[PDB]
Amino acid sequence: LVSGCNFVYVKPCRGGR
DSSP, X not given: XXXXXSSTTOSSOOXXX
């Protein structure tokens, strides 16, 4: 993801694929 990280404060918002 880019907007809202499902995983805690990761960059980029991984944990969504």
